[PDB]
Structure formats: C-alpha cells, structure tokens
Amino acid sequence: NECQLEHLNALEPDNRIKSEGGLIETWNPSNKQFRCAGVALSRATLQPNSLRRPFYTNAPQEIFIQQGNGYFGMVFPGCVETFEEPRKFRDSHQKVNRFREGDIIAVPTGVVFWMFNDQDTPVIAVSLIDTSSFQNQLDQMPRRFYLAGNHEQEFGGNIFSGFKRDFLEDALNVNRRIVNKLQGRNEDEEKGAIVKVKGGLSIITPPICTARLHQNIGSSSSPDIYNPQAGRIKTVTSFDLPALRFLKLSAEFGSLHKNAMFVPHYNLNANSILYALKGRARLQIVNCKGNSVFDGELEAGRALIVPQNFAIAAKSLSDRFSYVAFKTNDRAAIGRLLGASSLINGMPEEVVAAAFNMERNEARQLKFNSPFSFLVPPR
C-alpha cells in the first residue's frame, strides 16, 4: 500500500543530465513518497541564451520559476499564429509570454512547450508532473515527447526520427538535407534538451487559444494571508486561473519569518509536494496513528511529500523560510486543527472538554489563548 508511510525524508534529485546549455535534475519517481503522491518532480536550469527545446508530456504539469526571467511558448492544436511581422511574413508564430521569478505555469496534457532564457542570470524551473492524472491514459512512467534533438529521456531521439525520410520529404516537400536536420541525424548526442543559442534569439514580442496559463504567486504578488510578523501565503487555484480546472493542479507559495509558525493543518482533498525555495524550517508530519512520520529540517532545494489528511506544522529557522507546495487538486482545501475559527474552535466547548477530559476553563484557553488563525509570530 503505497501510502502506508511510516518515515519520510527530505529528498534530493538522484539523477543529473547535463546538456550544452543547462542542467536537468530529476527526483526518483519510484521513491515511496512520489508513488504515494502519484507525481514526478524535476528541476531544470537554463544558462543565459539557452533554449529548452520543445516537448510535450502525457500528463498535466505545473512549473514554478524559482529564479530568473525569460520567454516561454505553448503551442496549441487548432490555433492560428496571432503574432505576425511584415516582409509573406518575416516571422510568424503563436502567442509567446514573458515569465519571471514566482510564476506558476500550467502546461495542459499533450501541449507542446518551450522555454528560453534571454538574460544574464540562470533560470531555475521546478516542474511537477501528475503522472497519476486521469488525463494520463498511458502508464505511470513520466515521458517526454521531444520535437527536436537526439538525446535520451529525462527519467533516444526526437518524434520525427522514427518516421521514414522519404515520407517526411513528400509530406513537407523539402529536400533530404532539411529532413536530416529535422530528425537530428548529425546532432552530437551531448547537445541535449537545453541548447546554446549563440546570437541570442529574436522573436515577435513587444518592447480559447490565448487564455491565461500563468500567474505569479511569489513575494511580488498580493498574498491571500499575511501577518507582517509571521509571514504570508498565496495559493493559485482554478478560482484564480481557470486552466487549472482542467489540470486538477494548484500551487501554494508561502514565506515564514524566523521562529514564526503556522498551526497544525491538513489537506482535506490533495497530496502536497513541498519544495523549499529559501532557508530552512523544522517540519512535523503526523499520520493517522498519531505518529511522527517526519521531524527534521527541510532546506532550500529539497522536496517533501505531505500525504492527504496527514497533519503538518512548521517553524522557520531562517530570516525567511519560503516554499512552493504543488497540490494534486485545483481547489485544495486546508483544515486548520488549532487557532481562531479552527476545527477545534468550531466544536462546542463542552464537546472539547469531554473529548480531551479538560476543565471548562482549559477548553476555553485551548480555543482563545492564541488569537491567530494560521500564522503564529515567534514565541
């Protein structure tokens, strides 16, 4: 039973794939935590003027921009090129988008996606693949379908290299030399998924098909929950970003001040993949037997699964502990066990007293000694 987990560990990637233009790191999808969550996690690093070459995946994805700035393009079936430049055209393509640190990008199942770092700073993008989504009609192995290149799977060759050249020549009405490049015959195998682009790239961009697929949930955004002496929380859901209703995925960004806490809580209807972005915090996770299945530090760059209904609480050990939690539900609901208007505060006082064998005045203290809802300032 994949989720009878008695002990959890802060996880690092167990595989690194270097390409000429960057790095892709994958967490082992067969690790017990990721099989319980039913997802896969990867982290891509794009050096300046490097291009993540186009690929599509047989499952929905959420991509969080941990660092950097650049451009991405999602290329949809049944959509015309709405970006046009004269001279029959000098250039033509579907809408492209800027991304920045703190953006969540929703990639629907099967949609082609590419990404370009146009700046001097490396882009770091953490992507969550929901391999157990009911939109994945294959199997639980994460797959990438690359339209270009000649490299292996992240967890080889591109989609065109399996077709006959004479077929592609007739269908495209192009000579053999173009089809050989299309198929990536002459490509060094080490060029990889992220490639260098010497001169940089000129695309059409200013100094339904066009629906919004990204939203910033980082520090620059307006938070859902904020206490200037404890921290902040901001979730992107299908109430903010309608595409997520199709992906059945959401994400929560949070930042916790040193020695600040958020109360014990659990996700009613989702597994969470907690990925630390900055600093460290001591996390405590409790299962149905009331046993600690994790008590320890989660530090920047590592992932930790919080199974559905498992209770969790945290205390920051840094100036700012901040994280992104990917959740397997477009409308993940949080149940707070303690605090103002918490699940305990919603019970009649004499129900609390009898349940815990407490004095009436002790039940009231349990409810009302701390006035805070979710974030608790230090001490």
Q: Are 285 and 225 in contact (CB under 8 A)?
A: no
Does the CA dihedral 59-65-67-72 come out positive or negative?
Answer: positive
Measured from the CB of residue 220, what is the shortest distance to a copy of itself in angstroms? 26
CB of 285 to a copy of itself, least distance (A): 8
- Give me the least distance between CB of 296 and a copy of itself, in Å please: 11
Out of 9, 31, 100, 156, which residue is the one contacting a copy of itself (CB under 8 A)?
A: 156
What b/e sequence results for 145-177 when a residue is b if at least 16 CB atoms lie within 10 Å of its CB, and e otherwise?
Answer: ebbbbbbeebbebbebbeeeeeebeeeeeeeee
The smaller minimum CB distance to a copy of itself, of residues 143 and 302, is found at 143
Tell which one of 14, 16, 174, 176 touches a copy of itself (CB under 8 A).
Answer: 174
Sign of the CA dihedral with 335 first, then 338, 339, and 342 last: positive
Is residue 219 classed as helix, strand or coil in its secondary structure? coil
254 is a contact residue toward a copy of itself (CB under 8 A): no
Binding region for a copy of itself (CB under 8 A) out of 7-15, 61-69, 213-221, 288-296: 288-296
What part of residues 355-374 is at the interface with a copy of itself (CB under 8 A)?
355-358, 362, 365-370
Which parts of 220-239 interact with a copy of itself (CB under 8 A)?
none
Question: Of the ranges 7-15, 40-48, 61-69, 306-314, which one interacts with a copy of itself (CB under 8 A)?
Answer: 306-314
In b/e form, how buried is each residue of 282-315, taking b as 16+ CB within 10 angstroms?
bbebbbeeeeebbebebeebbbbbbbbebbbbbb
**Residue 291 contacts a copy of itself per CB under 8 A:** yes
Site for a copy of itself contains 160 (CB under 8 A): yes
Beta carbon nearer to a copy of itself, 145 or 318: 145
Q: Is 261 in the site for a copy of itself (CB under 8 A)?
A: yes
Residue 211 as a binder of a copy of itself (CB under 8 A): the answer is no
Residues in the chain: 379
The site string for a copy of itself over 125-144 (x = CB under 8 A, - otherwise) reads ---------xxxxxxxx-xx
**Residue 42 vs residues 91, 155, 223, 303: alpha-carbon distances, Å:** 33, 9, 26, 10
In the complex, what is the shortest distance from the CB of residue 190 to a copy of itself, in angstroms, rounded to a whole number? 14
Closest C-alpha to 41, from 19, 59, 22, 54: 59
Signed CA dihedral, 252, 337, 378, 258: sign only: negative
Which is nearer to a copy of itself, 58 or 66 (by Cβ)? Answer: 58
Tokens of 122: 């490396």
Which range binds a copy of itself by CB under 8 A, 213-221, 228-236, 262-270, 297-305? 262-270
Over the window 44 to 83, marking each residue x when it contacts a copy of itself by CB under 8 A and - when it does not, the resulting string is -------x-xx-xxx--------------x-xxxxxxx-x
Running DSSP on this structure, what letter comes out for residue 179?
Answer: H
| 147 binds a copy of itself per the rule CB under 8 A | yes
DSSP letters spanning 279-345: SEEEEEEE-TTS-EEEEEEEETT-EEEE-TT-EEEEEE-SSEEEEEEEESSTT--EEESSSTT-TTT
Stretch of residues binding a copy of itself (CB under 8 A), selected from 98-106, 230-238, 250-258, 302-310: 302-310
Contact criterion met (CB below 8 Å) for 57 and 110? yes
Question: Quick check: 1 binds a copy of itself (CB under 8 A)?
Answer: yes
Report helix, strand or coil for 6. Answer: coil
Judged by CB under 8 A, the residue of 114, 119, 224, 300 near a copy of itself is 114
187 binds a copy of itself (CB under 8 A): yes
